[PDB]
Design an enzyme around this catalytic site. Structure first.
Site, PDB file in Angstrom:
ATOM      1  N   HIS A   4       0.869  -1.187   0.000  1.00 41.49           N
ATOM      2  CA  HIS A   4       0.000   0.000   0.000  1.00 41.49           C
ATOM      3  C   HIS A   4       0.898   1.227   0.000  1.00 41.49           C
ATOM      4  CE1 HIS A   4      -3.538   2.408   0.614  1.00 41.49           C
ATOM      5  NE2 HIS A   4      -3.060   2.941   1.733  1.00 41.49           N
ATOM      6  N   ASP A  40       0.836   5.160  -0.111  1.00 44.86           N
ATOM      7  CA  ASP A  40       0.133   6.448  -0.049  1.00 44.86           C
ATOM      8  C   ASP A  40       0.850   7.558  -0.803  1.00 44.86           C
ATOM      9  OD1 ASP A  40      -2.069   5.717   1.891  1.00 44.86           O
ATOM     10  OD2 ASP A  40      -0.301   5.298   3.143  1.00 44.86           O
ATOM     11  N   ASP A  67      -8.168   0.954   1.485  1.00 48.92           N
ATOM     12  CA  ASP A  67      -7.960   1.957   2.529  1.00 48.92           C
ATOM     13  C   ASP A  67      -8.934   3.130   2.589  1.00 48.92           C
ATOM     14  OD1 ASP A  67      -6.441   2.281   4.892  1.00 48.92           O
ATOM     15  OD2 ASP A  67      -4.967   3.583   3.944  1.00 48.92           O
ATOM     16  N   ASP A 107       1.586  -1.505   4.459  1.00 46.13           N
ATOM     17  CA  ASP A 107       1.993  -0.194   3.928  1.00 46.13           C
ATOM     18  C   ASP A 107       3.467  -0.190   3.555  1.00 46.13           C
ATOM     19  OD1 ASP A 107      -0.569   0.425   4.610  1.00 46.13           O
ATOM     20  OD2 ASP A 107      -0.083   2.081   6.001  1.00 46.13           O
ATOM     21  N   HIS A 144      -6.856   9.350  -0.540  1.00 49.92           N
ATOM     22  CA  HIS A 144      -7.537   9.242   0.762  1.00 49.92           C
ATOM     23  C   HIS A 144      -6.760   9.810   1.957  1.00 49.92           C
ATOM     24  CE1 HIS A 144      -5.293   5.428   0.279  1.00 49.92           C
ATOM     25  NE2 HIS A 144      -5.049   5.528   1.595  1.00 49.92           N
TER      26      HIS A 144
HETATM   27  N1  LIG Z   1      -3.419   2.813   6.227  1.00 48.79           N
HETATM   28  C1  LIG Z   1      -3.103   4.169   6.703  1.00 48.79           C
HETATM   29  C2  LIG Z   1      -4.350   5.033   6.889  1.00 48.79           C
HETATM   30  C3  LIG Z   1      -3.746   6.426   6.703  1.00 48.79           C
HETATM   31  O1  LIG Z   1      -4.728   7.454   6.604  1.00 48.79           O
HETATM   32  C4  LIG Z   1      -2.943   6.259   5.402  1.00 48.79           C
HETATM   33  O2  LIG Z   1      -3.759   6.240   4.202  1.00 48.79           O
HETATM   34  C5  LIG Z   1      -2.266   4.892   5.615  1.00 48.79           C
HETATM   35  O3  LIG Z   1      -2.219   4.131   4.394  1.00 48.79           O
HETATM   36 ZN   LIG Z   2      -3.608   4.628   2.788  1.00 48.03          ZN
END
Ligand SMILES: N[C@@H]1C[C@H](O)[C@H](O)[C@@H]1O
Ligand SMILES: [Zn+2]
Ligand SMILES: *[C@@H]1O[C@H](CO)[C@@H](O)[C@H](O)[C@H]1NC(C)=O
Length: 1016
Positions: free
Chosen positions: A61, A63, A175, A312, A442
């Protein structure tokens, strides 16, 4: 024939509002599956002729901003994840990996040498690396507008088609903080066949798991027939991390996360570490793991099981790829060869899982339930409802909607022509689309990133606004200048944009004054653009350096105008009051602009030495004890003063509004005859708990119902004009304004929460409407869903996203509040609406952000308020889960999200200027929009292609004839059409070759895309 979206209630197995009414939401300890139960399975369920097929799907994952910026995570983590994925997948042909965030993949791929690009393309082509969703980001689903969800999806998938030659048909959304049916709506119209979601309320996971309803055909709430349905997999457990994905017992599953044995600085909170798999323990280890898999499989209807393997920013180090791969390979070799388990396990991809599920379904092994509804408001545990992020960082939530419109207008204005490469049009539009798309993440629009990451998103969006402005003003100059005179400098500013509502009066003084004078410049051209496909009239305003200004169109016909002062509010530290000051050197002129569908109209502002014939001047009344004078420079009307008092106003033959002595609405009278209907605005505050869990960027954990803001004796300013009137009041933390132009009022709040720690400011409307426990909120600006306020749930669970509007109604009366920004809101008692304005929180709320929300800044929130009689409207039955706007509420929403754009010519004389563009464009019904117009080809293409996304909403029938409009055929908007195709919404696949090159209009609540080809 079009489906009726009002009068037939769909029959679905699971309807989420009905499920909510029935569910008890008890938070009991379920054992190792904390929020479930002890799953039991019959070992004899599987056997040699019926094995469990297990797909372990490695994932990471990533971000695009959260605790670090996009570029910081790219340099520190993601470039290494992708480089090592390339290497390890190349070297290990049975290993697999899925990838979701195309912003990062494009960032990576363009820095690769050709040798590595070719190796990447090969592991994608052979199916080892598989893209899931393929959007630029994994977007928020609560605050995002559907147009920007589609924009980011298109940005990522267009990249993938161009560079990787693939288009994902399975979506992965592990997520976002709760899930919206707008996703399957867009995805199903973009070629998708399957989607996966994760963050749904723990009680919903338990309920659907007990019924084996975690896989379902998700259709829209109005869809009787089911043609919108998309197969959806909901994951069953608390997280997507490895402890919560192998099975119900995280103490067991953590032992199968081989990054947790110590050298990577990770461990298992359940105190049993992973053990390296060996010949001496593989039988025992496999016993433990297969038992977890068979328990998870009990929750689903087929013999095909999905086991995500990731977390993550995983799969970074080469040693991590090896430790996960080698240990799983040892387990798979043992398990697959031990007939007594009756399992076949392997690494797989998401599409491989869904293909095997549907093969099982076709072989008659499973039938799946139908579902409609949404999955808000999410709670991950106990009373921790994630409604705070519906409001967090509201400045950037408002900025999202401003940039949304600017991107649409820049793409539309520039689509009319082909541009030489030197104009850098495609470059600026790509930058704008990518920065807006990134913010749909997100942790972007949600307001859940660290302060310096929010600053990075804001800086990116500011550059995107500048890019849009450049493209728009170059386009206006080309569209409105005689072609044999047009002589563009593609770096020059021919026009500047004037925006009255962003960043806003009191937020930034960025508007330019038009400077006129007998000894400098007598007049100025201004141009309005209307992105909507119908004729629009709308008041527009500009700042001018004299009050003696008149307006004409470009046939020199006088236009009626109103001049008002420029008022600014100051918190006066000497007197400790909030009061307005008027400018003595600049003034506002307001007039009605009439602009063609998708077109432009030019007007001229001219100075004179004295009051012009067709310009009127507003009166101004300052209500306060202890006034002092308010000189206005040359403004010809002196300000009047009075003690605080109730006042009533009416513009045109529009509604009459009555205000309290504190400057807040008290009642609305729609017609000269009709009753004064009570409609009261009030500001209140929520606090934070002093024991237990604290509110933060994600969570709203109020310490009980809100308390009224103490208003003192605020100063009230009344401006009364022929064309526009207003009442403005300086309250603590909010300059609140009600503006009247002759229809539904506009509300503007300049919200500055200052240093008020642990405070959330709410704006509430109190009425007598007998709404009971029902209210309606929108999803992504696309549809309105019925909500029921449940007293069995805490206050924060009854808060929902308000991405564009909300309403309450009874048999006779409806009150709708439309918004220019996504915020959180509810109806906590019959006859009320409320919407949060800002929140300032000192503590972190334990979801990993590691800060509170203490970076507030002044924001100008905008709204429209529509009170209406609805007893003659044809509404859905009481059992229908949807609601629909009236014509006037929909137009008010369009006024907020897609206003006219205003351009001021920057030089002294515009040679070759033309008065209008688009007068021949069809003026389409009112429920239809051209959501996107985008030229898809650069100038070197012999066959130019233009894409259009057409959306038709559904407006209630309330007996207004409201008629005669012209058919809109987007494929004939540009000349020399040679082909018209219906496409997926991303424009990437042709679905139908259309007869006569005519694009048909679409059905209510449908969205279609068309591409016209031109041989010009
Ligand atoms: N899983 C966590 C949640 C946080 O807001 C961010 O998106 C990280 O990936
Ligand atoms: Zn996330
Ligand atoms: C893209 O993939 C398609 C699907 O098989 C293939 O036919 C086509 O040749 C590919 N285009 C290339 C080779 O880049």
């Amino acid at each position: 024939q079009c489906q009726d979206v009002v009068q037939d209630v769909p029959n679905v197995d699971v309807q989420m509002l009905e499920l909510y009414d029935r569910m008890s939401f008890k938070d009991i300890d379920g054992g190792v599956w904390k929020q479930g139960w002890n799953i039991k399975y019959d070992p004899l369920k599987y056997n040699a002729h019926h094995k469990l097929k297990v797909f372990v799907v490695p994932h990471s994952h990533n971000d695009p901003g959260w605790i670090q910026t996009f570029e910081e995570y790219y340099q520190h983590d993601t470039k290494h994840i992708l480089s090592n994925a390339l290497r390890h997948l190349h070297d290990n042909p049975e290993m697999k990996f899925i990838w979701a965030e195309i912003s990062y993949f494009a960032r990576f791929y363009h820095d690769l040498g050709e040798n590595k690009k070719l190796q990447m393309k090969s592991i994608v082509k052979n199916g080892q690396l598989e893209f899931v969703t393929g959007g630029w980001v994994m977007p928020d689903e609560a605050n995002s507008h559907w147009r920007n969800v589609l924009l980011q999806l298109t940005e990522g998938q267009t990249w993938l088609k161009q560079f990787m030659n693939v288009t994902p048909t399975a979506s992965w959304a592990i997520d976002p903080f709760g899930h919206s049916p707008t996703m399957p709506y867009i995805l199903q119209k973009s070629g998708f066949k399957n989607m996966l979601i994760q963050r749904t309320h723990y009680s919903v996971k338990k309920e659907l798991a007990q019924q084996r309803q975690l896989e379902f055909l998700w259709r829209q709430i109005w869809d009787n027939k089911g043609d919108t349905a998309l197969f959806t997999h909901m994951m069953p457990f608390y997280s997507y991390d490895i402890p919560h994905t192998c099975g119900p017992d995280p103490k067991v599953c953590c032992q199968f996360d081989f990054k947790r044995m110590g050298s990577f600085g990770l461990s298992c909170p359940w105190k049993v570490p992973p053990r390296t798999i060996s010949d001496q323990n593989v039988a025992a280890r496999s016993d433990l793991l297969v038992d977890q898999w068979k328990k998870k499989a009990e929750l689903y209807r087929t013999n095909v099981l999905l086991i995500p393997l990731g977390d993550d920013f995983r799969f970074k180090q080469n040693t991590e790829w090896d430790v996960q791969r080698v240990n799983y390979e040892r387990l798979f070799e043992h398990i697959n060869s031990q007939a007594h388990f009756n399992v076949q396990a392997q690494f797989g991809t998401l599409q491989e899982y869904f293909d095997a599920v549907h093969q099982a379904e076709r072989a008659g092994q499973a039938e799946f339930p139908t579902l409609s509804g949404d999955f808000f408001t999410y709670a991950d545990r106990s009373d921790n409802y994630w409604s705070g992020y519906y409001t967090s960082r509201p400045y950037h939530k408002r900025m999202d909607r401003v940039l949304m419109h600017y991107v649409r207008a820049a793409e539309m204005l520039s689509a009319w022509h082909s541009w030489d490469g030197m104009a850098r049009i495609e470059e600026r539009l790509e930058q704008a689309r990518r920065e807006l798309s990134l913010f749909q993440h997100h942790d972007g629009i949600t307001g859940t990133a660290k302060t310096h990451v929010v600053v990075d998103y804001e800086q990116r969006m500011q550059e995107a606004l500048k890019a849009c402005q450049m493209v728009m003003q170059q386009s206006v100059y080309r569209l409105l200048t005689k072609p044999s005179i047009y002589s563009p400098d593609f770096s020059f500013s021919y026009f500047t944009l004037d925006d009255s509502r962003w960043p806003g009066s009191g937020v930034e003084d960025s508007r330019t004054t038009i400077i006129l004078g007998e000894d400098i410049l007598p007049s100025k051209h201004v141009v309005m653009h209307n992105t909507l496909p119908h004729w629009r009239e709308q008041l527009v305003d500009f700042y001018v350096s004299s009050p003696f200004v008149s307006v004409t169109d470009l046939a020199n016909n006088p236009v009626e105008a109103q001049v008002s002062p420029v008022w600014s509010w100051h918190h006066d530290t000497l007197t400790k009051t909030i009061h307005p000051q008027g400018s003595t050197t600049k003034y506002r002129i307001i007039f009605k602009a009439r602009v063609p569908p998708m077109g432009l109209a030019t007007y001229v502002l001219t100075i004179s030495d004295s009051k012009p014939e067709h310009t009127s001047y507003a009166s101004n009344l300052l209500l306060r004890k202890n006034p002092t004078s308010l000189p206005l420079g040359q403004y010809p009307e002196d300000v009047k003063f009075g003690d605080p008092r109730e006042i009533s106003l009416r513009v045109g033959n529009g509604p009459t509004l009555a205000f309290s002595e504190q400057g807040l609405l008290k009642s609305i009278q729609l017609t000269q005859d009709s009753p004064h209907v009570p409609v009261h605005f009030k500001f209140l505050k929520y606090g934070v708990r002093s024991h237990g869990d604290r509110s933060g960027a994600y969570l709203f954990l109020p310490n009980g119902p809100a308390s009224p803001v103490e208003l003192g004796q605020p100063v009230v300013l009344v401006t009364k004009g022929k064309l526009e009137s207003s009442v403005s009041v300086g309250l603590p933390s909010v300059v609140h304004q009600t503006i009247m132009r002759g229809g539904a009022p506009e509300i503007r709040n300049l919200v500055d929460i200052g240093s008020l720690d642990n405070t959330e400011i709410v704006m509430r409307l109190e009425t007598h409407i007998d709404s009971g426990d029902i209210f309606y909120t929108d999803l992504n600006g696309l549809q309105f869903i019925k909500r029921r306020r449940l007293d069995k749930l805490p206050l924060q669970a009854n808060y929902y996203p308000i991405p564009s509007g909300m309403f309450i109604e009874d048999a006779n009366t409806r009150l709708t509040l439309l918004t220019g920004q996504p915020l959180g809101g509810s109806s906590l008692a019959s006859g009320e609406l409320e919407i949060m304005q800002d929140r300032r929180l000192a503590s972190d709320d334990e979801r990993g952000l590691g800060q509170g929300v203490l970076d507030n800044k002044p924001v100008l929130h905008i709204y429209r308020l529509v009170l209406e009689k609805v007893n003659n409207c044809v509404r859905p039955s009481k059992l229908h889960p949807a609601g629909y706007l009236t014509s006037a509420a929909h137009k008010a929403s369009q006024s907020l999200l897609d206003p006219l754009d205003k351009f001021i010519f920057a030089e002294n004389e515009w040679i070759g200027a033309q008065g209008q563009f688009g007068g021949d464009h069809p003026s389409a019904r009112e429920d239809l929009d051209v959501s996107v117009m985008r030229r898809l080809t650069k100038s070197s293409a012999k066959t130019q292609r233009v894409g259009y996304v057409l959306h038709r909403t559904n407006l209630m029938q309330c007996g207004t004839p409201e008629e005669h409009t012209q058919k809109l055929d987007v494929c004939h908007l540009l000349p020399n059409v040679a082909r018209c195709e219906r496409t997926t919404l991303t424009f990437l696949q042709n679905l139908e070759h259309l007869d006569g090159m005519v694009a048909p209009e679409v059905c209510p609540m449908e969205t279609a895309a068309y591409v016209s080809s031109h041989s010009s």
